[PDB]
Subunit: 299 residues, 2 copies
């Protein structure tokens, strides 16, 4: 069985704060004596293009209010870095977890802690898609909601801060250095993301999960090698497959080769008509190899 | 948009402990000075039917080890209540959240904190099905993983302790009184659960969600009243619809009566062939009214 799960949120919850500037409110992340939040918090109320360099030069520290669970923190200084602010506050978060900052790549899975007014309301796993957007569930006020991963040694990787929802409904964020994923503008615009490609590495993982569950009506005995599949993938809305050897644990157990699964993808590309694979009516790219392995075997 | 989410797990993570008896290890929940865990932990290693009353009668307190993040709690006494043990320990959990215990009904959504050796590894939302099982993700050692909801005032409702995986893959748990949901046996056996019905109230909530996203190709123009739908529901594997007036909010905003969605359920029952509703190719009973309302309007 396959269930999308999030990693536990407790150590990240203790870092979420409410950041207010004037009347504008969003979420920030408090590590040590620094709060990171989207710079949208200092935007003037207007319908014209936002000049953030001008808003930054006219910023006054006393217009900020930063709080953790209703306890207000004193603001010492603020610098702007791409699409985020770094707010120095006058005391350190005594529950700062061991952490690093990591910039995601397309195909990476991570966890979103969806937050409103400095308070977490939900947690879910997501994948950064090839168009550098995610499909989240955010209502008004989710700006600044953090994305994270928890390494095996317990280190939190801070990798995402929610920035904006595009007209299409797709969600855009930045890393903690202020670079927006996909170079989208961090203010209202008419921007549209590129077409989403199916994540081939995840699809291969999904088909191995199907095999391990005894679902194999779809298996091809044809073989397509990596170079051939990657050329087909270009023309058919799929990514290249990154490598084959990482699947060897699943390959030995099944015992089906990655190249057989690549041929199976080409066979199943259009539809299942109208059978299903693990309940899905079309190929699923939601689950990574690491998830299939960890959910099947704890590794 | 509709995404299955879990409520934040921080306050529950601080209650999970490792419970060991002899060589057998599983998870427990530490509230005040009590640890609740599945009684499977005192089972003898064997392939015969387990007699839990005899296992309990021959129990020795010194065979228990209860620990939280590597520090060991002193065990004071143990009682058995249905499928769970209540282990009294000599320390109170200083991180005990404000909490109540609540027994779930089919169609209720809740959150699972999946745990291994007393450490949380994943959190996800699930729905209790009409056969009283859930579709989770558990591998070996997840026994005792807790299920919970968090009310608006912050109170944690403890509602589920993971007990066993059935031969079908479906998951069985107990409440914190030790009653097994669906009264399945809490030991290895050949039991098979009865078939699931489609949770009609959840399907309605799902269709209200689609209307709010401009997904309306499936909307029936005509209506069927509740009494006619419930007759159809029996003969077609759906539960009876509860009431109509709960959906007033979404009935208002759409503005579509529940009776119109009931007619659409009848029409969509076979298949979409091959159109789509919010990503799904068949009707989805995964989301309750409360989740839809919370995810779209707060």
């Amino acid at each position: 069985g396959l269930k999308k799960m999030a990693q536990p949120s407790g150590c990240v919850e203790r870092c979420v704060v409410r950041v207010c500037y004037g009347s504008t409110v969003l979420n920030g992340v408090w590590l040590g004596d620094t709060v990171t939040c989207p710079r949208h918090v200092i935007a003037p109320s207007t319908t014209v293009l936002i000049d953030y360099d001008h808003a930054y030069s006219t910023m006054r520290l006393h217009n900020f209010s930063v709080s953790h669970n209703g306890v207000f923190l004193g603001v010492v200084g603020v610098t702007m870095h791409g699409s985020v602010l770094r707010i120095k506050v006058s005391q350190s978060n005594v529950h700062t977890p061991k952490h690093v900052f990591k910039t995601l790549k397309p195909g990476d899975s991570f966890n979103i802690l969806a937050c409103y007014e400095g308070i977490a309301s939900g947690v879910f796993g997501v994948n950064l898609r090839t168009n550098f957007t995610i499909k989240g569930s955010f209502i008004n006020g989710a700006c600044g909601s953090p994305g994270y991963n928890v390494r095996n040694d317990g280190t939190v990787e801070f990798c995402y801060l929610h920035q904006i929802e595009l007209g299409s409904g797709a969600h855009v964020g930045s890393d903690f250095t202020g670079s927006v994923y996909g170079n989208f503008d961090d203010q209202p615009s008419l921007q549209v993301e590129s077409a989403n490609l199916m994540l081939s590495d995840n699809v291969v993982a999904f088909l191995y999960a199907a095999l391990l569950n005894g679902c194999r009506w779809w298996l091809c005995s044809t073989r397509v090698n990596v170079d051939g599949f990657n050329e087909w993938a270009m023309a058919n809305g799929y990514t290249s497959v990154s490598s084959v050897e990482c699947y060897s644990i699943l390959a030995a157990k099944t015992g089906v080769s990655v190249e057989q699964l690549l041929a199976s993808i080409q066979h199943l590309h259009e539809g299942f008509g109208g059978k299903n694979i693990l309940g899905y009516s079309s190929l699923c790219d939601e689950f990574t190899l690491a998830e299939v392995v960890k959910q099947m075997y704890g590794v």
